[PDB]
Symmetry: D2
Subunit: 114 residues, 4 copies
């Protein structure tokens, strides 16, 4: 299922483990200074009708090495089978002063392959 190593369109790598508790843990990454801790949740008892499995996770972009004062959340679903995929939409927020709060959040989409 979801546990394993996933790659997106643009080279990022995420190694995740799905607990039976609905917990998601892993890293978004190779080299230490590019690795960040992730945490999230997923639906551990999805519908049995062909629907995907809902899930979400967060990465705060601060590690031992660097800090971009920002965090990304990904919301999407796992679709299993032949080529398993995770289709997501994401929000990136940066810490801003009150003056720039209007432009603090980027939106995008990502697809991961196992």
């Amino acid at each position: 299922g979801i546990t394993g190593t996933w790659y997106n369109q643009l080279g990022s790598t995420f190694i995740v483990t799905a607990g039976a508790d609905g917990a998601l843990t892993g890293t978004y990454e190779g080299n230490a200074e590019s690795r960040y801790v992730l945490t999230g949740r997923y639906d551990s008892a999805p519908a049995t009708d062909g629907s995907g499995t809902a899930l979400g996770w967060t990465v705060a972009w601060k590690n031992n090495y660097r800090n971009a004062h920002s965090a990304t959340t990904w919301s999407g679903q796992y679709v299993g089978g032949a080529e398993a995929r995770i289709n997501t939409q994401w929000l990136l927020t940066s810490g801003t002063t009150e003056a720039n709060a209007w432009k603090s959040t980027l939106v995008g989409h990502d697809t991961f392959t196992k």
Copy 2:
């Protein structure tokens, strides 16, 4: 700072602990006072924010499954903590539901929330 209980306009509250390791752990109560409405929250925050008056970036996730219900969906909030006489967390959120591939175009809602401590 972030550690505490937070309420929105609209009848929702959450209790959270901001760990020194950048972890966010807590429980989200969808309907204030309703015990079957409690869900695990887990997220991350910037544990060393800028000292230039900028807020503190964060995010969390709730999958809407608990002992009592399962809505087959998950919400993620992305935003920032703004300290003040009245502290706030300002967010944008994405709620994704499980769908078949054909209905994927309609699986994700977007909105915004503001919580006050």
Copy 3:
């Protein structure tokens, strides 16, 4: 009730004419006063809304180019009109700027705006 002059929280102002056509035309003054801050807007609205209490779906676009300035980007607002004496337009918006392909992942901001008449 849509036709008229609207203001948001940030002190942007827009003036719209709502056509029976379902056309929305007018100008968006991101500032107040100056020609230099004035841009064309165009959009569309549901000109035969449900009469069950639900609001009126609408959308419009501004490209941030005028004869004084060009920010190489455009914003789209998607929302609905709630009529009556305390009329309001609640929106979510997307701002996209021109980028290279390599940099397209950071080209679009999302946010929300509330307008009052």
Copy 4:
């Protein structure tokens, strides 16, 4: 290069004209299925390799049907060889205000000429 006929990732077609004044005017076929489109684009884009920013709106009402909804697409045009439009979109339906929180969907679409 924006003027023309564009096709998305399964079905939908649109025909648009890019006016000298920054206007986009056209027709969107969501498969009786034809609707008015209107928008704006950057008529004087940077010459540094950057795409052309744009946006357009469709309200889903024509003389045959009405879904009490409107979609806005925001994105950019990428010219040359494999010219395309990459967009993200917001779909808002009229709702009562108790149901406001669930009025707006968000997505992405890519168009080809």
